[PDB]
Amino acid sequence: KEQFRETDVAKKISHICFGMKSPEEMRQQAHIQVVSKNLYSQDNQHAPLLYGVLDHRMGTSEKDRPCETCGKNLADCLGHYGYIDLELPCFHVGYFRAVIGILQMICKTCCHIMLSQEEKKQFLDYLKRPGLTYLQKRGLKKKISDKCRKKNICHHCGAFNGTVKKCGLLKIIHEKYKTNKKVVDPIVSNFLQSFETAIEHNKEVEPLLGRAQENLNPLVVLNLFKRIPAEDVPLLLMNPEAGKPSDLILTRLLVPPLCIRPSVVSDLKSGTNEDDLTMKLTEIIFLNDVIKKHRISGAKTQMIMEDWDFLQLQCALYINSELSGIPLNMAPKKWTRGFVQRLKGKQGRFRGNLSGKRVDFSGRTVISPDPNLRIDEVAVPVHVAKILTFPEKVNKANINFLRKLVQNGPEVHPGANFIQQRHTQMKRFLKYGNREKMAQELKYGDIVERHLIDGDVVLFNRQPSLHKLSIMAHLARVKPHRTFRFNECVCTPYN
Amino acid sequence: GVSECIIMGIPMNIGTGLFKLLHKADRDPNPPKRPLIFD
Amino acid sequence: RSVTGGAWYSDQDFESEFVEVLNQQCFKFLQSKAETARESKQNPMIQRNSSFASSHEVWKYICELGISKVELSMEDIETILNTLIYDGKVEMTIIAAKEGTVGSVDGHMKLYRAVNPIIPPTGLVRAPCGLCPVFDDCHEGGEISPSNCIYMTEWLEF
Amino acid sequence: TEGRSRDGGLRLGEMERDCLIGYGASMLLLERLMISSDAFEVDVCGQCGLLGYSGWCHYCKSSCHVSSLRIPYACKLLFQELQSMNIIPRLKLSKYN
Amino acid sequence: TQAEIKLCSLLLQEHFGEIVEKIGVHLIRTGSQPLRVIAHDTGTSLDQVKKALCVLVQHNLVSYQVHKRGVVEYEAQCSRVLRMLRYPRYIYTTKTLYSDTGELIVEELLLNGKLTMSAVVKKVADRLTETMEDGKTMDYAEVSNTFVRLADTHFVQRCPSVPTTENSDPGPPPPAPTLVINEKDMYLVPKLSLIGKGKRRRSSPIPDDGIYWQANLDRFHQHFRDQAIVSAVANRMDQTSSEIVRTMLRMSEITTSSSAPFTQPLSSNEIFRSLPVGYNISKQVLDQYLTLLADDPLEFVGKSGDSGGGMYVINLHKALASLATATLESVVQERFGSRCARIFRLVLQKKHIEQKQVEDFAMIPAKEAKDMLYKMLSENFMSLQEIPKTPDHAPSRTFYLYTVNILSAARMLLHRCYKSIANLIERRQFETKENKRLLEKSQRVEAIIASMQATGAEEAQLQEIEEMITAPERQQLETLKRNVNKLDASEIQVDETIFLLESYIECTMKRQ
Amino acid sequence: LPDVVLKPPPLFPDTDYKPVPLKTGEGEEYMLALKQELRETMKRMPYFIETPEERQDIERYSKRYMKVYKEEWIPDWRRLPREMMP
DNA sequence: AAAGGACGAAACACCGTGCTCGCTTCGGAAGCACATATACTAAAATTGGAA
DNA sequence: TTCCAATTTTAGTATATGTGCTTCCGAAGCGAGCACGGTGTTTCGTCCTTT
RNA sequence: CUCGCUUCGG
Numbered sequence A: 001k002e003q004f005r006e007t008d009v010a011k012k013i014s015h016i017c018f019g020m021k022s023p024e025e026m027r028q029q030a031h032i033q034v035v036s037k038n039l040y041s042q043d044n045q046h047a048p049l050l051y052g053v054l055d056h057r058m059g060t061s062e063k064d065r066p067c068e069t070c071g072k073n074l075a076d077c078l079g080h081y082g083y084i085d086l087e088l089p090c091f092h093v094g095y096f097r098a099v100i101g102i103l104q105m106i107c108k109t110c111c112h113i114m115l116s117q118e119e120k121k122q123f124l125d126y127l128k129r130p131g132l133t134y135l136q137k138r139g140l141k142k143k144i145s146d147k148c149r150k151k152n153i154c155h156h157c158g159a160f161n162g163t164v165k166k167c168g169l170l171k172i173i174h175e176k177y178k179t180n181k182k183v184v185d186p187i188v189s190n191f192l193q194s195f196e197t198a199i200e201h202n203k204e205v206e207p208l209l210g211r212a213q214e215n216l217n218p219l220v221v222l223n224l225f226k227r228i229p230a231e232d233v234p235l236l237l238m239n240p241e242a243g244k245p246s247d248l249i250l251t252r253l254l255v256p257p258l259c260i261r262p263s264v265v266s267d268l269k270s271g272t273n274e275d276d277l278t279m280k281l282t283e284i285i286f287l288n289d290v291i292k293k294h295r296i297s298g299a300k301t302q303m304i305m306e307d308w309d310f311l312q313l314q315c316a317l318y319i320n321s322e323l324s325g326i327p328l329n330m331a332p333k334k335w336t337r338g339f340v341q342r343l344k345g346k347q348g349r350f351r352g353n354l355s356g357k358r359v360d361f362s363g364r365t366v367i368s369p370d371p372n373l374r375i376d377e378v379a380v381p382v383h384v385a386k387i388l389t390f391p392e393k394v395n396k397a398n399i400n401f402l403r404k405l406v407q408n409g410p411e412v413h414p415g416a417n418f419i420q421q422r423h424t425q426m427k428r429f430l431k432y433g434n435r436e437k438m439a440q441e442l443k444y445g446d447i448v449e450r451h452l453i454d455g456d457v458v459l460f461n462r463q464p465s466l467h468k469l470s471i472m473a474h475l476a477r478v479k480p481h482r483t484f485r486f487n488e489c490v491c492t493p494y495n
Numbered sequence B: 001g002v003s004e005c006i007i008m009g010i011p012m013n014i015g016t017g018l019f020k021l022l023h024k025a026d027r028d029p030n031p032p033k034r035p036l037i038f039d
Numbered sequence C: 001r002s003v004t005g006g007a008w009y010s011d012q013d014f015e016s017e018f019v020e021v022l023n024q025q026c027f028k029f030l031q032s033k034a035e036t037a038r039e040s041k042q043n044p045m046i047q048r049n050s051s052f053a054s055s056h057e058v059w060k061y062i063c064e065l066g067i068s069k070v071e072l073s074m075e076d077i078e079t080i081l082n083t084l085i086y087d088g089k090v091e092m093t094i095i096a097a098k099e100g101t102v103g104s105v106d107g108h109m110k111l112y113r114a115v116n117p118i119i120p121p122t123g124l125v126r127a128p129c130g131l132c133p134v135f136d137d138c139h140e141g142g143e144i145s146p147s148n149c150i151y152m153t154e155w156l157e158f
Numbered sequence D: 001t002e003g004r005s006r007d008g009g010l011r012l013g014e015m016e017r018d019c020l021i022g023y024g025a026s027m028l029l030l031e032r033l034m035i036s037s038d039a040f041e042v043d044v045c046g047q048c049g050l051l052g053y054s055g056w057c058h059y060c061k062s063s064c065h066v067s068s069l070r071i072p073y074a075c076k077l078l079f080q081e082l083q084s085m086n087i088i089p090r091l092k093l094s095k096y097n
Numbered sequence E: 001t002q003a004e005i006k007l008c009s010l011l012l013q014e015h016f017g018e019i020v021e022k023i024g025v026h027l028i029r030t031g032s033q034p035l036r037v038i039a040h041d042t043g044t045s046l047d048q049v050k051k052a053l054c055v056l057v058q059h060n061l062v063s064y065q066v067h068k069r070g071v072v073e074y075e076a077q078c079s080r081v082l083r084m085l086r087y088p089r090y091i092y093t094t095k096t097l098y099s100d101t102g103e104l105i106v107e108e109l110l111l112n113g114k115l116t117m118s119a120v121v122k123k124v125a126d127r128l129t130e131t132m133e134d135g136k137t138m139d140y141a142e143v144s145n146t147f148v149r150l151a152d153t154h155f156v157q158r159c160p161s162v163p164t165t166e167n168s169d170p171g172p173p174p175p176a177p178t179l180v181i182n183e184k185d186m187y188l189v190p191k192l193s194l195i196g197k198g199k200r201r202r203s204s205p206i207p208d209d210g211i212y213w214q215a216n217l218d219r220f221h222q223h224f225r226d227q228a229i230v231s232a233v234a235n236r237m238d239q240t241s242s243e244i245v246r247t248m249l250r251m252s253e254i255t256t257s258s259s260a261p262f263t264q265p266l267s268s269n270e271i272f273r274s275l276p277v278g279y280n281i282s283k284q285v286l287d288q289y290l291t292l293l294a295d296d297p298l299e300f301v302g303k304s305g306d307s308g309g310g311m312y313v314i315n316l317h318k319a320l321a322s323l324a325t326a327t328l329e330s331v332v333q334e335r336f337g338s339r340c341a342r343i344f345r346l347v348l349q350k351k352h353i354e355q356k357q358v359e360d361f362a363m364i365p366a367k368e369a370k371d372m373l374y375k376m377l378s379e380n381f382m383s384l385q386e387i388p389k390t391p392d393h394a395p396s397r398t399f400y401l402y403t404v405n406i407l408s409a410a411r412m413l414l415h416r417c418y419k420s421i422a423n424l425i426e427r428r429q430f431e432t433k434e435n436k437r438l439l440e441k442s443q444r445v446e447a448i449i450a451s452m453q454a455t456g457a458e459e460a461q462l463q464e465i466e467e468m469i470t471a472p473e474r475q476q477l478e479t480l481k482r483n484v485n486k487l488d489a490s491e492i493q494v495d496e497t498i499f500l501l502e503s504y505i506e507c508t509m510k511r512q
Numbered sequence F: 001l002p003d004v005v006l007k008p009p010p011l012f013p014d015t016d017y018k019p020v021p022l023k024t025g026e027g028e029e030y031m032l033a034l035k036q037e038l039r040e041t042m043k044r045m046p047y048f049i050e051t052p053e054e055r056q057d058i059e060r061y062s063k064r065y066m067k068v069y070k071e072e073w074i075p076d077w078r079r080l081p082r083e084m085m086p
Numbered sequence G: 001a002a003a004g005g006a007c008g009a010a011a012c013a014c015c016g017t018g019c020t021c022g023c024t025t026c027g028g029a030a031g032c033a034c035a036t037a038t039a040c041t042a043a044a045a046t047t048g049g050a051a
Numbered sequence H: 001t002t003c004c005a006a007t008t009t010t011a012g013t014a015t016a017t018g019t020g021c022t023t024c025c026g027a028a029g030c031g032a033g034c035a036c037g038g039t040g041t042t043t044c045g046t047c048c049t050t051t
Numbered sequence I: 001c002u003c004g005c006u007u008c009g010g
């Protein structure tokens, strides 16, 4: 007849498993693909474009237009992601160092890690112990990196492995064909002599034949990371369940929901206030379209690589808006807020919205002395007490008291501002309707938002807080004046 | 840790959250079981 | 001829049709010569030598054909044969010949012969996944999956 | 919001949180920083560890493992920003028992 | 090796089951591990772990080694699990080279992994009694003759043998017997005087005990490489050259190992005398063939000596590189057209080259050669050299040179082939799963005929099998069958490209 | 400047090159038939360990009639390490 | 002074393109501070060679 | 055959370029908001020549 | 509204 499904379980978060998403998983998670670089439609209504940025299938950011994925308003919409396909793979700046590290660990030809079998077994045994800590993992990664950089030839395929270093910005160079002051290897001589046709057609190649090492563009790095054996992935200290080496190079961008990027319709002019993320995404999509157009139209290799570098730089700025090795001609003109900027700083999420955040049901007033109050009491102005409400639950003890409070209404000081019914959660404003009937219909379990009355425990604080006694709980007593008053003997803790 | 408890919006382990409270309800643990006739 | 003109460029337009017809005619001539050499079966050395065609000889044959009005130099046909070599259908060897009816390169003459491909098309290209343009995005569970793949649908239906 | 002109509320700064921690008042700290400021109820899929909507997980295309969970809204914003940064936070839920 | 892991998972699930494919995949993904940690990580019972490990080690898919404190650790051979896909080719090539008796021998060896010679001859005789009829019995003598003929040609090899316990450390038994391999008795068949006749499935102490045999896949790979080289040279020059090089490789088979840059050199006179007499060829014709092949710009063979008349050697690694190059150019041509293949061959012959030089040498108009070059760059078919004028590596002040690296492109193509075969198997399994309902319905209606075939078999059950609604569904059944046939054929034929690429990749490694 | 696109590109973009037709001959069809035979025969092989069915509803007199019977191969424990005996 | 056909201009969308007309061009670092990796350099050890 | 001399190899060990930080609220207000360069198209007003 | 900048208060 009816299937038994559990309504709600008191689920508690146990732990957070950090990780990475492969390009396939990004498409699976996302709802739509963003391909239009424009934002609004041509018509004067300026509705957001379809399959472009600000599409309301990615949530909503305006109180009037609901989300298209889930038919809910701005208050209830959790937001939904989209995905943007990149024509050319680009290095993830946040993982760039990691990429370099991994490129140092493994062979550049057979993709195996630079470790002997005995050292492999030893490191696996050391990693297999239970209770491995984050510091232990970092130390093991450092030791393995040192011992891998000790070697120079491959025990698996025999290919030479030179040094891998960061040249320029977001570019990796592998010194495969290093100069040998001693007798030269056949490989380097063959590589040097393979430039015969290029030298014949371009003489300038010959003076610059030196310093011509292997360049690991994101395509080659992605291809190499796709061929790393899964056995050696734990030896890179990377959790196989969390992610894979191929995930370090991004080919899809998860464009965030509209809730992260609010848009303000400033109808006073013909424009809107948009955050930096939307403009960065617009520029990235424009660059993808430009690269595709250049590939179609047969452009030079120099400008193709320039557009690829521009796309990499734009992705890095979208992730982190404060980089160092930016070329002066490639430097941004103005200042944009990347995700790192939104996270770090005194106004970031952690310090400005997570560790310490603004609250309601609070007030801030000038103080004046009052010696006639006990040291555990504080005088609250009548005006503030009429605003700061306490939700008192109707029980068998305070029913006759809450009835009188409801009868008084929101104007007389001992009284209430709202009534929340037990069965239906529809709040009732006490300024309207017959208050006597509402008082006569007070059921047990109803919530009455009573005014702050005498005896209520109230926190009292001086904002420059040095020690724990800078904030204390007092008992509120309502007084006709407009200042917070307390006994002067309590001045010394608050300073 | 305390900071992650604050971020996740869960009661922190230190302070009043170290212990757990039980209700001294009128009860009988391991109540008598109705016998099975067919088995 | 480099900065302007050229036997291929006509009014700042590359002639794809002209080069295609040149490739077809040269390859047909080389294939016919190789077929005649194989059918001769007189001796393997003589068979291979007769299958060989000089650049001057094929240039004279092309001039006899006279497909286009523009005069084609010997090195023009040499470049056409080089493109045919890059197509994997003909093979060139530089032999030692001090002087003769060609006399082009000092002591060396280039002989071209139509040669069969090494192997038939590989097994990889016989499957749609080997030619799929969205092979990177293919995944077991997702929008692009082998279970619902259109390419194999058309391929099996065909 | 921030200011009096915008009818903003007062701010529990980092040191206020530190003083509340020093007192050991866990329940009041939770009520002030979660219940009274940015309380929210999200839907988390217990299988993939990602955030769902309206009791449904689009990633898993299922609704069996989706469970409601109380959380500060700023934490949800942080999780979504981290997901956009390819730093995927996967939540392994459990019963409160 | 994620594609390799997926393909191994599919093969093990199709061939052995589920509780065993999980163990195989875990071993491949995590490497060598002791039994208890495998059981703990997999999450299944210890008995199932033991059954999976023993059934895997029976087919030589995994091996066990001893370590410190006498712990036994099991490591899987991913290459062997991938070689499992070549079983139809192994059976077909042993049926081509020998009689059907050898075909059945190799089939039993592959289906059982390890077997004794008495067991294999008994099974082959039992199966062959069904092929013939009219009371003819299958004797063990001819089966043993075919088995020893396979053994001397190195197609079947003895499994590693446990050392004698009494002579080697008599006392406490080790956790693992530490099987070692001896090349003296590697291909020595035992003397088994017992003979017999296979039973006709009427359904109404071992002299060679401890001597286990298996299929030597290395010999099959060497034979396949010889076949590929012979076919290539036949396509190049003539069938006469193919026969000449086939005879040279046949002579080289025994005297050389499976991995050498060059084989043992041969003289002209021994090639002439070893050639089949069916070819009316004189000594000077053979010398002409040898010297004209020696001048081939493919360098299949080489002189490498003057003594004994025409002294010649065969270049194996050069031939494999040429075959890999041909495979790469063929896949490029079939995926992007003949013009793109022209560009690919141009940039292969010229080691480094630029866009303008490519356009000048290919006679391909601009905006199309550049587009095809960018397309091939997007698929890792070539890499840019990017010689910089300054260490800043700015694009405006550097030269970009196109260059095809055969090794990296071959590895990419092998990975793509692995994923392609995985996708083909997935599609076949999906179609089978979705049509299993009609499969069961048709199995039932055809088993109505299959049941009571002769006993109590009235004719009134022949006009009602097609009476049910399965008749209009037979078209869907036929489509399913032809789709499965085509998918299996393509899966088999991609294995040839996989073999060529894998051989080229293996022969370019040093394993130092 | 590149044009703006109103709809995302098709999920499976079309290709003007089609896969080469499969190789044909007696040998290739023999390979196909042999592979199908191996599929059909190696599932019934005792090496193919099936998932153990469990949770029998009831015991019945028909169980003995429906009891699945299959010959089991005996591993050579001399080569196999000692830990895998049942 | 009241006309009106054609011409000219001027003011607002519009797309190629990237906030600077032309390609340049400065200064200052803000301080206290723990990382880095480069380049060096140096010694010590091992192997080749005179006696 | 073996003591000295030379070369290499790696390792360690000092500076010097990078990245990273720098009190807690609170309150007003003033600015200014992405663009602008030139190009085209449309609309409107008036230099003569006409009642 | 967002952002920055200043001036305050303490």
Ligand SMILES: Nc1ncnc2c1ncn2[C@@H]1O[C@H](COP(=O)(O)OP(=O)(O)OP(=O)(O)O)C[C@H]1O
Binding pocket: A464, A495, I010
């Ligand atoms: N920047 C600030 N940070 C924290 N608290 C502050 C700050 N500025 C002012 N205050 C508050 O004001 C108080 C400072 O007063 P204090 O310095 O003790 O007397 P004063 O200002 O020197 O007066 P006299 O000059 O002595 O008459 C203490 C503190 O709570």
Ligand code: SF4
Binding pocket: C128, C129, C130, C132, C133, C134, C135, C138, C139, C144, C145, C146, C149, C150, C151, C152, E423
């Ligand atoms: S399954 Fe379909 S989409 Fe995936 S690689 Fe094969 S043909 Fe392409």
Ligand SMILES: [Zn+2]
Binding pocket: A058, A059, A060, A067, A068, A069, A070, A071, A072, A077, A078, A079, A080
């Ligand atoms: Zn929504």
Ligand SMILES: [Zn+2]
Binding pocket: A107, A108, A109, A110, A111, A112, A154, A155, A156, A157, A158, A159
């Ligand atoms: Zn290697």
Ligand SMILES: [Zn+2]
Binding pocket: D045, D046, D047, D048, D049, D050, D057, D058, D059, D060, D061
């Ligand atoms: Zn989920």
